A and B are shown apart, each in its own frame.
Chain A
Amino acid sequence: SMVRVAINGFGRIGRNFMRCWLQRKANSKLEIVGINDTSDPRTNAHLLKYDSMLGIFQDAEITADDDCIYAGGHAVKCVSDRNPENLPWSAWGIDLVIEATGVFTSREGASKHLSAGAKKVLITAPGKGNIPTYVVGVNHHTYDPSEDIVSNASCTTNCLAPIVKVLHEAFGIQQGMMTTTHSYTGDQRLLDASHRDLRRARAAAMNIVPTSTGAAKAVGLVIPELQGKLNGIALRVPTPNVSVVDFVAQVEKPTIAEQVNQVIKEASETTMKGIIHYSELELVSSDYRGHNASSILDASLTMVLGGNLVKVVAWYDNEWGYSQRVLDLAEHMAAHWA
């Protein structure tokens, strides 16, 4: 029988995730039976169906009443309570909560779902404090089925970590720096306005906006040999989706661009198939909407100096690709459910 899933937070990730599940529903061990969100079912149904980035959902009918949303005649119960302690998880027999609000990323925060009755939580963001973090294709097999709260990290860490692993195994990464040139996200204001972070306050579609990021350090969680060896920053720019990681590493074994490319091409066809895609095409951000890989290496941009300083560039669809990984991680947990 199925693992019973509720989505907490029906936002860009919550709705991308839902759309990913609807496309892969026939082979799945997950059944999405509930959603909680600030908004009501009719608003959620409307936004699930009409998406400025994904287009109109055509695969099946989407409908709503006061209580439920219906996707292809699958009924999903809706509730709207900002306090996860109050949610009907025991009553709905919820096994796994997908925590996509961006608000309950600490153990104590996420545990509120457990005390409301869910058996496990998968947080769609980096965890705060001691929360086991997974990137599919890198360390997802180390998942321990006894764990009640996990994190699927960030979009950026999902893009960077698999490249780093391949490069580390082939060349030995000593140190590395990252910049993600990233689409704007919903934590940025539309026009200049009040915000705790003075950069996130500024008009998102009008500016290049630097922010600090934990994404590079977080690679050290999932590749423990590299802990404390990576750092970077983010630059948000006026696109609404699709991002790119720029990674410059100091490596031990001297190499050249051709060889770096070859090694990532070989991984994309074997150990990292479905996770890293290797491309020699001269494409731009739009072309990567809806791409299922965590990282698309842009081979033409790869360069090396003095044998040891390696630059690689990898695209990622930060909403859809990441949501596909969230789903992969959930399917994995369901296949390993004690």
Chain B
Amino acid sequence: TSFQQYCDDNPDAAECRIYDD
């Protein structure tokens, strides 16, 4: 919830990166 917020705010962060291979 604070984690989902952190990935919205920081989508390049290590915890967040989703690359479409």
Contact = CB atoms under 8 A, between A and B. Distances in A.
B21 A196 contact: no
Interface string A100-117: 011100000000000000
Contacts of A214: 20
A193 interface: yes
B12 to A, nearest CB: 5
Interface string B1-18: 001100100011011111
B3 A125 contact: no
Contacts, number: 52
Interface residues of A, number: 30
A150 B12 CA distance: 21
Q: Counting chain B CB atoms within 10 Å of each CB, which of A38, A186, A236 scores highest? A: A186
A193 B14 contact: yes
Main secondary structure of the interface of A (DSSP, over half): loop
Contacts of A103: 11-12
Contacts of A4: none
Which range contains the number of B residues in contact with the other chain?
10 to 19
A185 B19 contact: yes
23 contacts: A38-B12, A82-B12, A102-B12, A102-B19, A103-B12, A125-B19, A125-B20, A126-B20, A155-B21, A180-B21, A185-B21, A187-B18, A193-B14, A193-B15, A194-B14, A194-B15, A195-B14, A196-B4, A196-B7, A196-B16, A196-B18, A211-B21, A243-B21
A125 B14 CA distance: 18
Contacts of A243: 21
Contacts of B18: 187, 196-197, 200
Given A185-B21, A189-B14, A214-B20, 15 more contacts: A38-B12, A102-B17, A126-B20, A154-B20, A154-B21, A187-B19, A193-B15, A194-B14, A195-B14, A195-B15, A196-B15, A197-B18, A200-B18, A211-B21, A213-B21
Nearest to B7: A196
A214 B19 CA distance: 10
Contacts of B17: 102, 186-187, 200
B14 A182 contact: no
A68 B2 CA distance: 38
A187 B11 CA distance: 11
B15 A101 contact: no
A200 B13 CA distance: 13
